[PDB]
A paper describes a structure:
Ribonucleotide reductases (RNRs) catalyze the conversion of ribonucleotides to deoxyribonucleotides, a conserved reaction that is fundamental to DNA-based life. Contrary to all other class Ib RNRs studied to-date, the sole RNR of Bacillus subtilis displays class Ia-like activity regulation. We find that B. subtilis RNR has arrived at a remarkably similar solution to the ATP-cone through the evolution of two unique allosteric sites that modulate catalytic activity by inducing contrasting quaternary interactions that either enable or prevent the full range of motions needed for RNR activity.
With insight from SAXS (see the section “Methods”), a 2.50 Å resolution crystal structure of the S-dimer was obtained by co-crystallizing holo-NrdE with 5 mM Mg2+-ATP, 0.5 mM TTP, and 1 mM GDP. Electron density at the S-site could be unambiguously modeled as TTP coordinating a Mg2+ ion. Electron density at the I-site showed strong evidence for an ADP ligand displacing dAMP. Interestingly, we also observed nearby electron density for an ATP ligand with the adenine ring positioned against the F47-loop. These linkages, particularly that involving C695 and the initial site of the catalytically essential thiyl radical, C382, are likely artifacts of sample oxidation. However, they allowed us to capture the flexible C-terminus, which has never before been visualized in any class I RNR.
Author numbering:
A (entry chain A), B (entry chain A): 6 to 238, 246 to 685, 695 to 700
Amino acid sequence: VPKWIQLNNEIMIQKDGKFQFDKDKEAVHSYFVDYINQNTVFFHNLKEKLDYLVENQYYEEEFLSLYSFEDIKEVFKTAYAKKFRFPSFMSAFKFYNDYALKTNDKKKILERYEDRISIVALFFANGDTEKAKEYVNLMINQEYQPSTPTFLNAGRKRRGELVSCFLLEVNDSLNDISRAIDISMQLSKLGGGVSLNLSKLRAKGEAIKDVENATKGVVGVMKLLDNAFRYADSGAAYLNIFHRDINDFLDTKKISADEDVRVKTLSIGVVIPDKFVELAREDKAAYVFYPHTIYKEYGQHMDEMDMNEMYDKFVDNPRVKKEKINPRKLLEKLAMLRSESGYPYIMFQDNVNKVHANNHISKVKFSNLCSEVLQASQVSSYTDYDEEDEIGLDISCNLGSLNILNVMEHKSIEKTVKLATDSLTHVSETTDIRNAPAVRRANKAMKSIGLGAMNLHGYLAQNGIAYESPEARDFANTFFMMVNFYSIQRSAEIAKEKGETFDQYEGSTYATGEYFDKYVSTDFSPKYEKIANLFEGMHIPTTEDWKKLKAFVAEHGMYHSYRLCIAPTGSISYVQSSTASVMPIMERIEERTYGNSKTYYPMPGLASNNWFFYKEAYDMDMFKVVDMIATIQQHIDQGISFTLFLKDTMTTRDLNRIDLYAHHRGIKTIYYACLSCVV
Amino acid sequence: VPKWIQLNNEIMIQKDGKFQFDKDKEAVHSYFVDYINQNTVFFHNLKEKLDYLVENQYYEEEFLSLYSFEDIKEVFKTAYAKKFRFPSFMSAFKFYNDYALKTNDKKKILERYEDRISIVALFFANGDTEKAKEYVNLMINQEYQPSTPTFLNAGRKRRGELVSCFLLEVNDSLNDISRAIDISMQLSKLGGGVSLNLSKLRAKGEAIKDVENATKGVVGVMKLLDNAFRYADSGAAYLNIFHRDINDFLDTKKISADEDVRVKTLSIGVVIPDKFVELAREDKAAYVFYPHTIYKEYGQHMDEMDMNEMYDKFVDNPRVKKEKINPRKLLEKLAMLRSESGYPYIMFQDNVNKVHANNHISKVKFSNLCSEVLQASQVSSYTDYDEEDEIGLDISCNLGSLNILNVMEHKSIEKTVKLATDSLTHVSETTDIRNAPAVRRANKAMKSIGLGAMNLHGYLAQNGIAYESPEARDFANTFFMMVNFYSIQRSAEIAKEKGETFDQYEGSTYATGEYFDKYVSTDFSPKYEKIANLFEGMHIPTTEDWKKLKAFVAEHGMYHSYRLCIAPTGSISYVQSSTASVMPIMERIEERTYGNSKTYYPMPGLASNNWFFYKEAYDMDMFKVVDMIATIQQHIDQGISFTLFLKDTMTTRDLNRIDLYAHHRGIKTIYYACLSCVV
Ligand SMILES: Nc1ncnc2c1ncn2[C@@H]1O[C@H](COP(=O)(O)OP(=O)(O)OP(=O)(O)O)[C@@H](O)[C@H]1O
Ligand SMILES: Nc1ncnc2c1ncn2[C@@H]1O[C@H](COP(=O)(O)OP(=O)(O)OP(=O)(O)O)[C@@H](O)[C@H]1O
Ligand SMILES: Cc1cn([C@H]2C[C@H](O)[C@@H](COP(=O)(O)OP(=O)(O)OP(=O)(O)O)O2)c(=O)[nH]c1=O
Ligand SMILES: Cc1cn([C@H]2C[C@H](O)[C@@H](COP(=O)(O)OP(=O)(O)OP(=O)(O)O)O2)c(=O)[nH]c1=O
Ligand SMILES: Nc1ncnc2c1ncn2[C@@H]1O[C@H](COP(=O)(O)OP(=O)(O)O)[C@@H](O)[C@H]1O
Ligand SMILES: Nc1ncnc2c1ncn2[C@@H]1O[C@H](COP(=O)(O)OP(=O)(O)O)[C@@H](O)[C@H]1O
Ligand SMILES: [Mg+2]
Ligand SMILES: [Mg+2]
């Protein structure tokens, strides 16, 4: 057993009752000197390194050719000037095991952490050598972490797509079903996570032409999709809760499900308008609808109509066919299934669209794997082979997360937010997906990005603030207000600089101005003095600054239809020495076995004198956590991946009381505690 | 229990030891007077009938509008002038239960047998009122029976496609696989039987781009197709025996197969070049090949190269990857699987192409469900969404069968063959399949039809000739030579009349003349005197008549790339009072239960003084049956659906000796004893 693993395990051998937290500094030092340095290829110079990496098909050539090699050396030297040292064993282990470029034979290390960062920065900057330096500092200071698809792939040949998260609409025809199968496979082949909205497909037992009772329904298309994802080397189906197939749709995922209906590689999500929550509260028998009878009567997809306005009219219309269900029992079934599998991802549709800026394009109808992407979409119609198709708007989103601790300590909320936006904008403009025409069309038209945040709990716990406290909410309220301020400002700056807005921007609430109403009348500076001290050195936007930004946007518009969403953070959380996303930590010390050895990872910053503040999520009040997320969500235009942390000693009514409380507080999406759609 | 069922069962109550065969004449009379006539809607006139059937969306309007109603009445009266009476209970039962148009509520009969025939004839004739009369007589005399898809659908609204048999090529890309899934569903939705050639897909464990060992292989695409056919309301996959996946391909159909690999709605067929049969005979270890390594080396699909020429070169080429197998044991496995399921349909590829007329277009590479369609094909390439596709040639075939007994008694071999061709040509020209571009392109370019024959055994047994006798072969030799003569002659007549040939006709052996070599040097008039007497009244083509037809074709060409194939005959065999296809009868008397009653159907014409000639197939020598089929096959340009009739007391070596003997005798396809691809 290696020496770094020896010192690593010595954390768990207590001294004066205290753990040996300092042993992990030795462990990662031993891990480098006695291993990493000896398997890292070292060239006589950097040009020799880059020429080798280019000539051996490791790196791409075009993006490097935009720089004079004297500039590439300055950028690399900027990365190494930091003298970055991983503070823990698992942080360095995860980077070299998951991210560092290895040789084709997987024997030696080609990239140090400074190398991957320099290459990504050279890619983002697109020739601007000083900007490349800015990106290097931003990443080497660990202020910003682009998503794994971007951070891992930028600058490679054989490089996968930098975006790997996609959402698809599916129209109610065999032609469209066939095209969705192929698109799913085309994206999944590229490593993408694909979520499809099935709410427009007619329900089981609806007519085809004049043959009554002919349709397989949603479960039939799920079976085809399940197989498509199996063949092409993870997908999701969403369904509106008022769709007649909702029960059958859910039952495909019961762990006891019969194999005739079983679907094994599809996640599921459920879309819940306010009207359903009211019916459930009142314990009144509800109706679910056969969507094609609604289409034949109203000429519109049920999915494109306002169920809060239309429910009673659908019920009274004799040409609309429906079924009676028990809304409380359906709500209970959603709790049971999430205890089994985490998902169904639950989306409170009216909590999304109440504050949605682009309802003029469409209401938000569904979300992605792990349910943080919330954007408008419009269904295509792929017609017969000899006819032109009608290309709509699907969704793809490009992700990154700033690191709250390092942003606060560097007092760089503005600079990080604006710079990270520039990078996500570059990934959006260099993406051209083939074989997904509505994804490609939407990416150019909508120009949407998704900037998030990680290390919320870690930063709070290291500054003496409990995750569940009202002080924690007071910090989050202010911090994310500021993130949103500078995000909107940078999007308008890019719109002025380029002279473009996203397509149909002038119909958005950004252009008509009501987006800014709460920001010009309400102040979001800290109510607690000790929280205000954390922001010392950074100007906090006032209602007056918001009035001037409102006016600025009104003159120049905005480049991005969407800017912010908070995805989960996977392995990269280790590399960042950061608690995952904005969630509370799960364990104070993680024990995982790797290759016949047990490794220990205490939470980033865990000491004996802050033990109390690293409170484990399962011991927290989920109602207080809901309050925290609802506070962050005020200033995020898309969504927040939100996993409830529950003990098995929870009755099904306790579970639904959380659901109802989350809906009450304005939460957009929720599930219980996705690789392509995480940072 | 009804009276017709009473008299029907009285056949089986013997008199002087003899069955009561005459009781079935009473049964079908009782079946009409006491039931059929009372549930048949009778209008005051025919215009009242047709107007009702048009106005109630039963019939189509366009084809009837091509006639003046005085002419429609003459055509209908021509049908009724025959005073056609069904000679047996089951013949009338099958027509009214399976073919006669009933009301939307399925309560009363709208069509008598004379009505369906008149409508089909009016459809075929396309305005020519005298031709409509010719079609009426041809069908009411039961000289010709168009296939069930055509006979059932012609003249309807809500009418399904008149062709329902299709064959598809699939290219080696994800794009092509996705298009084949959709095409399969588009055709299957229309009621089609779809067979796909999977021999071009790269084998399991081949590279994708530069990722080695990445491919699922043929079984992966079979699983997708299996699901496609399940969703869209029967298909087939063919594979060349030299494909590396052949064993895995076969194992998907073992009745004991694990569900991870199980395929439940796909038939399978295997394509066997001569080189494999030689390797099996010699008991020499054979090789199967990874087709993509062959493609990367030779630039051609293994499926498009001559394995008899290339086998040793493939084996010696170090850049071609292969696997060793046991050819004898593989041949044995094909016998086992056919005992289980009937198929794998076995195709002896060189027995097809040795006598194939259009090798210049392509070799024949695969066949259909029940394996009688044998035509050239060329693979498409469906490229990325933004790029033009390359449309190749798939296959569809339009079927019918003449009734040998009635053709011989009416001495109408010429008139039936030429008239049936005209009808199959009309079905071909009125077919426009959407969403299958290579099927549509091939149908116009190739103009192929498939005329067959039924009632061979019945006709032989009723003229004192045993199915296994050399006299039976002597009759078949002459009869089908004549069918082929007048078929070729009518195809050339249509080519002169229209001034067109099928595309690239001048590369065929019809144009270069070697097709006719055996017909200008060998006489095919009967060797047996009693067989020659059967043809009295009809001129038998001589070598001189063939020389003049050869010259005729050389001047005018031919309209049809393919003309003849002998499909199985399903329920319509009853309606025709005909033994199935050209096969020997299976049972002298069929006992089947329908609705709590047992029905009896003795073979068409079975009497006590011809009992010996209705010898049951399972008591026959399959080697003599192979001889019979090989004799018919000389004069059929496509294939013959050929089911072996075997007792379970057959060793696996006995089974392979039949296979080897069938190959020896030139048989093209074979399996053991399809609805969309039967007449
Ligand atoms: N394999 C490598 N070998 C050498 N330098 C590398 C390598 N990988 C990255 N670098 C980085 O490239 C930069 C320049 O490296 P190089 O050794 O060519 O220059 P130097 O000797 O440090 O400086 P100067 O140009 O003044 O000689 C340094 O920041 C170094 O850390
Ligand atoms: N339901 C039906 N009622 C009447 N005739 C029918 C019907 N179905 C088919 N036919 C056929 O239509 C043809 C003409 O029928 P119709 O009764 O109108 O004429 P008709 O009285 O026999 O002759 P004519 O025109 O000299 O009066 C006949 O051959 C008849 O068998
Ligand atoms: C994408 C994909 C293809 N395949 C199959 C389908 C095809 O038979 C083959 C890949 O064909 P293609 O889709 O044509 O792949 P490619 O063009 O990117 O790469 P290459 O140049 O090597 O053709 O492998 C899989 O087995 N799994 C997959 O996920
Ligand atoms: C063809 C087919 C469709 N479907 C589904 C797919 C679609 O959701 C719907 C049929 O859509 P379509 O493919 O659009 O059918 P259509 O246009 O011929 O008929 P209609 O005018 O009624 O749309 O039913 C099946 O369930 N099984 C099938 O076999
Ligand atoms: N925690 C660490 N993170 C990153 N690199 C490390 C770490 N520990 C050691 N190394 C690498 O090992 C080299 C030798 O280690 P050492 O001599 O202890 O440090 P230094 O270079 O500061 O004197 C360092 O220059 C560095 O490249
Ligand atoms: N075997 C049969 N096939 C067809 N139709 C039949 C048959 N037997 C009876 N029918 C129908 O029943 C009608 C009345 O039968 P019947 O009086 O016995 O015959 P016919 O009309 O020759 O005198 C016939 O006109 C005919 O339409
Ligand atoms: Mg439709
Ligand atoms: Mg390819």
